[PDB]
């Protein structure tokens, strides 16, 4: 048993459970927005997979929302950063007089933990595999994965 991911096409899967039918998605892959245009206007929501490329195999999922008049919204479950980072790019693909405002939400998961673990478990790795008469790379990732979801 193992899991991490962002999910993927199980994005369309969780949507269909909520009704709404099967939805047209969007993307930014290697910097190229695939999101267009009126299918969103009839749907009211994209959602978009960001941060993906030939290298990066997972992504960052966000949601395009259509508001009243010319208003469009961006929901990233963070919330200031990440979606002020997609603003200028994504807002270019909407019709001319459209405005894209980023929802002022507060991020979900609390990403600060990552930086802690880069310090905490990152030099603990240095404290382990480099150097000594060391365990394997699988063994170190297995320690760290257990250690990382332990404290929580």
């Amino acid at each position: 048993v193992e899991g991490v991911e962002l999910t993927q096409e199980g994005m369309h899967a969780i949507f269909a459970r909520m009704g709404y039918g099967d939805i047209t998605s969007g993307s930014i892959y290697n910097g190229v927005p695939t999101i267009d245009t009126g299918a969103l206007n009839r749907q009211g929501f994209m959602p978009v997979l960001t941060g993906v490329g030939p290298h990066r195999d997972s992504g960052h999922w966000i949601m395009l929302i259509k508001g009243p008049g010319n208003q469009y919204y961006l929901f990233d479950p963070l919330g200031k950063t990440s979606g002020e980072g997609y603003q200028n790019i994504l807002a270019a693909q909407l019709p001319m007089g459209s405005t894209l405002s980023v929802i002022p939400n507060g991020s979900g998961l609390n990403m600060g933990l990552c930086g802690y673990w880069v310090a905490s478990a990152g030099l603990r790795a240095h404290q382990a595999l480099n150097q000594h008469n060391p365990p394997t790379l699988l063994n170190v990732g297995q320690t760290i994965t257990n250690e990382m979801r332990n404290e929580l």
Side-chain angles (χ1 to χ4, degrees), residues 3 5-129 131-141 143-152:
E5 304 186 336
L6 198 76
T7 67
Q8 36 173 23
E9 315 129 0
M11 187 53 179
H12 301 73
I14 75 154
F15 262 105
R17 286 222 46 83
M18 307 177 64
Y20 299 118
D22 296 41
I23 48 93
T24 301
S25 205
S27 60
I28 304 93
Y29 183 100
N30 197 27
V32 183
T34 324
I35 68 111
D36 288 276
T37 275
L40 152 66
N41 293 334
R42 63 167 191 85
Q43 271 186 184
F45 54 90
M46 207 48 171
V48 201
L49 172 64
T50 77
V52 73
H55 26 50
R56 323 169 78 185
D57 271 20
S58 52
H60 179 42
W61 273 109
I62 65 179
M63 180 75 124
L64 241 49
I65 312 177
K66 155 74 171 306
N70 62 324
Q71 289 290 109
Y72 290 76
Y73 299 95
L74 200 157
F75 169 62
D76 192 335
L78 163 45
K80 32 184 173 313
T81 79
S82 57
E84 192 45 71
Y86 311 104
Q87 209 277 336
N88 205 328
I89 309 93
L90 296 178
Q93 328 292 117
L94 305 175
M96 277 202 278
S98 45
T99 308
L100 180 59
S101 298
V102 200
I103 275 108
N105 61 282
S107 176
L109 304 183
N110 175 29
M111 289 314 281
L113 289 158
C114 288
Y116 176 64
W117 285 333
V118 160
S120 153
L123 70 95
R124 183 149 54 235
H126 180 59
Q127 222 168 333
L129 79 163
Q131 312 180 351
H132 208 267
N133 318 281
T136 70
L137 191 47
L138 185 67
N139 207 344
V140 69
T143 52
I144 294 164
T145 294
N146 303 339
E147 297 170 353
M148 270 197 302
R149 346 162 162 266
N150 247 12
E151 322 193 55
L152 293 195

